[PDB]
Amino acid sequence: QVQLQESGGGSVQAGGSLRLSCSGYTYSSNCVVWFRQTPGKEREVVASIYTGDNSTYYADSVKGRFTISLDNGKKTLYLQMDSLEAEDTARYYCAAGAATTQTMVACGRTPGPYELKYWGQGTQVTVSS
Numbered sequence: 001q002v003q004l005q006e007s008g009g010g011s012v013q014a015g016g017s018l019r020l021s022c023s024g025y026t027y028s029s030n031c032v033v034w035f036r037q038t039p040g041k042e043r044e045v046v047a048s049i050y051t052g053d054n055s056t057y058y059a060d061s062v063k064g065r066f067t068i069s070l071d072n073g074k075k076t077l078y079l080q081m082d083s084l085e086a087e088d089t090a091r092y093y094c095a096a097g098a099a100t101t102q103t104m105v106a107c108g109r110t111p112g113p114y115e116l117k118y119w120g121q122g123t124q125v126t127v128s129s
């Protein structure tokens with residue numbers, strides 16, 4: 001069995017950049033998603049990638065401001081955050097596996113359902129300004 005692990009958080013001045021790293025996914029083909037937990041607010045999908053065809057879904061707010069990348073062996077997924085804004089301040093979560101078929105179709109394409117079998121605790125980002 002496996003549990004996802006995250007790293008790369010902290011406090012950074014606006015206009016800065018910072019790399020978020022998720023590790024643990026054994027899947028050659030499955031869905032990996034990064035959420036954001038704005039404190040005392042709702043969960044928001046940041047981005048998703050389907051390892052099978054490397055299809056990428058990027059949330060419109062972070063569009064062109066964030067990048068999602070996978071190391072060789074597809075053993076680690078990085079979310080490189082650029083041009084950080086105070087709104088992005090939150091705790092960021094990584095998760096993978098797709099329980100619902102209709103999450104599976106939407107991964108890398110639409111916001112969709114995005115329901116996920118395995119989750120990790122994640123790390124906190126504070127955008128100083």
Ligand SMILES: *[C@@H]1O[C@H](CO[C@@H]2O[C@@H](C)[C@@H](O)[C@@H](O)[C@@H]2O)[C@@H](O)[C@H](O)[C@H]1NC(C)=O
Pocket residue numbers: 051052053054068069070071
């Ligand atoms: C999927 O991509 C694999 C390599 O990842 C690519 O390069 C890294 C540096 C990241 O930028 C990542 O986002 C890129 O997709 C390939 O080894 C693999 O063959 C690709 N598979 C398919 C089906 O395209």
